[PDB]
Design an enzyme around this catalytic site. Structure first.
Site, PDB file in Angstrom:
ATOM      1  CE  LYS A 203      24.321  86.020  24.895  1.00  0.00           C
ATOM      2  NZ  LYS A 203      23.393  87.310  24.396  1.00  0.00           N
TER       3      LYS A 203
ATOM      4  N   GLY B 290      16.267  81.277  28.938  1.00  0.00           N
ATOM      5  CA  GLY B 290      16.264  79.985  29.714  1.00  0.00           C
ATOM      6  C   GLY B 290      14.940  79.320  30.323  1.00  0.00           C
TER       7      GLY B 290
ATOM      8  NE  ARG C   5       1.032  90.911  20.406  1.00  0.00           N
ATOM      9  CZ  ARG C   5       0.214  90.867  19.246  1.00  0.00           C
ATOM     10  NH1 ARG C   5      -0.022  92.182  18.830  1.00  0.00           N
ATOM     11  NH2 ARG C   5      -0.454  89.870  18.746  1.00  0.00           N
TER      12      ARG C   5
ATOM     13  N   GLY D 204      13.053  82.978  25.003  1.00  0.00           N
ATOM     14  CA  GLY D 204      11.855  82.364  25.106  1.00  0.00           C
ATOM     15  C   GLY D 204      11.613  81.393  23.908  1.00  0.00           C
TER      16      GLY D 204
ATOM     17  N   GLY E   3      18.369  80.026  21.677  1.00  0.00           N
ATOM     18  CA  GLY E   3      19.320  79.761  22.820  1.00  0.00           C
ATOM     19  C   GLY E   3      20.054  78.476  22.940  1.00  0.00           C
ATOM     20  CB  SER E   4      21.866  76.305  25.278  1.00  0.00           C
TER      21      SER E   4
END
Ligand SMILES: [Cl-]
Ligand SMILES: [Cl-]
Lengths: 249, 249, 249, 249, 249
Positions: free
Chosen positions: E59, E131, E143, E192, E213-214
């Site tokens: 990133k 997160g 959407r 999410g 994510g993590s």
């Protein structure tokens, strides 16, 4: 129903005969600005019906049950719950499904079109700006309805209901439109058609026919203008013939 | 109380005779931007009463106790606390229950109707838009009253009081309306009836009768026009007869 | 109905006995930011009823039909549709006329009082500010109701309907209040009575009785305090006796 | 479907067995405030299903297609697209008609109810204020839906479409409701039912059953509270039994 | 370009190895209110690259030309101009077309997507709410992009330019999207995704892959959780297998 043709507004038997000779698919009987605009006298409608063999249409005030019932009892082919006339009910439209005669209504968007179809309309048209000779309003209404319909044909099912809620449309009507891939009824162009190029443009934008008229009788050669409009609505991409016909007006 | 009839506005003895010959159930005595509108001169009311045998009505300014008492002493059948006249009290209406003659009042919703009934009114009518020839306001008022009454007939008891509190209606009057299932007095249509189709439409919406203005005498054949209005108010669903009668106007 | 008395909030049998010994006309069974406040457990109400011979009252949530019907089946004397409990219906009150047990309700003006009476309430009381010890709100509500009633007793008839329309009161209830010259039910003082001077002041303003909260048992001598409240509510103009009683608290 | 019964929220097999013994018509499996609220682990649902023979229900996030499809693959009887859980789609609900398992959704008004039915819901319930123990929200939602439905049953046809447009409801759903005379699906009371008197009140207001629970396991005698709620939902007008059962809690 | 895969955020060599063993298509090197978020140390990126054979991503701050050029010189496979880091330029993004390494960017609508593609982005992903564990924002963005693309594929040519003008999209990019019938690059789901049901739902909505994510390493069995995420992203309609895999988490 009568897709591809031109509908003219006539005021007597002579204009109706001129319309039939020009090649109009149907006629509209009418009797102009000021005061209250109601339905036409039944004598005028009977004369228009006796003058021609093409189907004759008449306008009724919005929400006026008795006017529409009288036009139905007269044997009129279609009834036009027209906003051109001074409305009779500013809240509720006629329940056209309870009628035997088919109905044509005006609309400016997919919401209005769906509300009219759910009320029982058999045919649609743009509201336009009647009497102005300006095609911009009909162009806007046609483009809005067509763009919304194109969206609806490719819209995810999970998003349909919300869409209806956002535009005030009946859910089942939108589902039917998505399943059929187009509007369940024909959508004509009305209000503003002044030149044959206007009719050709409205037919190029995706209209199923031209509904406006009345002004054709005001030309120096009314029969010539009527024939030009009729020939421009059909085969709307023959630009050479359109220019030739426009040169003679 | 004499439901289904037609009430006409007359200005002289000849108009009262013509209205009687047309088949009107009652007459309304009248004199005429128009300055201040007060009650009519007693001589005109006496002339109208001596001209016809049908019940005669006279208009009085809103809240004008003396005008109403004078019309009561004159022997009028019904008194119309009509807003069409310049009101005399813009805050309080007359105590119609303290009178001996019955009263008819205007209303636009169940709140106004209930306020008039609680004050002792014996009859109701829509306010409409008098003198305009447009039945829009009469349609609106009639539909509003009918919708609120339909609500009240099938409403829970616990929700009645608040309803009154939200519409300014007397609680006992609303309870009586709920128990009886309809309005305690007849509700007529007034203001805007221009054609026999308008009278038939007002009767189709559930009115108990029509109030005709002064335009009935403005036609080329006033007698034929009044006869058509009467014959359309009665049997308001015979659309073929309505169209036939309208063809002659 | 038993006007001039003192009603006390009790939580057990000992408090009911002490209130009876103090001379209270009736008792109120109670359990206790405080979450949700509902009706008391039937065992506590039965204990309060078996403890004293004076009439026992129980509070119910506003619009809670089932709580009120249960308290009616339990045999309570009066039911208090008390706003001090967390309301169950924030839009509609219970139809007290459809019950067999009498009801007492809170009010802050003639409009609320008339709305409660029209629903069938047998008794009224000021809402006040319960638990604050400040009689400001009770004074305000009592004075407002008394002022509006004084207006209504000497008001013209023509101005009654509009008055109801302006205060949300039932028309027939206001007419009855005007004809009788006073409220059809007794109006008590509640919420804020902290000292015997407060009870004497509420009675001086024209109340028909006082509602004492739970603070009466918070004094060092609760029995003496309750006796002083009772002896001050009765003969509320004997200021020397009031001062003497207050000197011992 | 399961009208007249009580539905309880269970967290293990012991609570499900206690519910079945109390007389619950169905159970609701769940695992509380903070973070994200998703569907329950399939192990809990499988345990709840293996524990009882009564039908077991599970909650899914709004718009979460995969959660509902997983609950359907598990053999769950009904799925609750519950707003209690943190929603997954804040714009579009699930198209429950494309599912095999029947669905139950929350609503606060006739508009929401019609939008959920048009989306394919088989059962309805009030949203209420879950976890608060306050019945006021369920009361409001039930009364609003019922009043709007009562209006719709007695509404003039010509006014139906507009009504839908004013509340965002599918036109066909409203027409079906008017033709059948009531809601096409059952409407339960959920969120706020704390005491058996609350369940009796919700059933007196016209609910088809009680949906809320969970809190019954928090009492000193959970089985007793469950049996009391179940017996108060049925025969909700036996106030003596209601008071007796409430005395023992 | 490698559509249908799963990309995981790794912080060390052990996490990269575990993600490779789980079946992830690519890895994302990361370091960690949190102050300023910059690019990761080159040593961590080199460790992640030496740990696994799958493509490694890093990133970079938005508009930080030097960070991106350094990551390009380090030999990274793809660079993520990620808004999850504290941006370096809040007005202009980097000219990704002037780089040799491909870029993936975030977007919430067709306007942002087209702006990123026109700048030279080789891949797209939803911004979501990183997160939070809530897939609401990812669902919304996906959407929205899908709806606008469905609009554009079946939209009239005359209406394209204005559309771009109304959404800030490059005209030629929108024309290319209309001609090809889909997005020119793959669109992944990010921010999410908490459960395997979330990955299956994002794939059901039409995503080309998921970004984890993590939190995948926060489970009691991180390896099993990652394997479940991978096995749910692939064959996202096998709901029975999804439920089985979720039962073990
Ligand atoms: Cl004009
Ligand atoms: Cl929380």
């Amino acid at each position: 129903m009568q897709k591809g043709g031109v509908i003219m507004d006539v005021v007597n038997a002579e204009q109706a005969r001129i319309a039939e000779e020009a090649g109009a698919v149907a006629v509209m009987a009418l009797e102009a600005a000021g005061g209250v605009a109601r339905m036409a006298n039944p004598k005028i409608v009977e004369e228009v019906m006796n003058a021609v063999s093409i189907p004759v249409m008449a306008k009724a005030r919005i929400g006026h049950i008795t006017e529409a019932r009288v036009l139905e009892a007269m044997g009129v082919d279609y009834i036009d719950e027209s906003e051109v006339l001074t409305p009779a009910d500013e809240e509720y439209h006629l329940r056209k499904d309870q009628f035997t005669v088919p109905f044509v209504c005006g609309c400016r968007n997919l919401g209005e079109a769906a509300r009219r179809i759910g009320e029982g309309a058999a045919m649609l048209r743009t509201k336009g700006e009647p009497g102005t000779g300006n095609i911009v309003e009909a162009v806007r209404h046609m483009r809005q309805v067509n763009s919304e319909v194109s969206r609806l044909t490719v819209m995810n099912d999970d998003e349909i209901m919300t869409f209806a809620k956002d535009i005030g449309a009946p859910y089942e009507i939108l589902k039917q439109i998505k399943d059929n891939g187009r509007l369940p009824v024909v959508n004509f162009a009305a209000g503003g058609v002044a030149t044959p190029q206007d009719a050709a443009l409205m037919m190029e934008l995706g209209a199923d026919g031209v509904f406006v008229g009345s002004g054709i009788f005001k030309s120096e050669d009314p029969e010539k203008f009527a024939k030009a409009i009729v020939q421009a609505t059909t085969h709307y991409q023959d630009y050479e013939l359109i220019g030739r016909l426009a040169s003679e007006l």
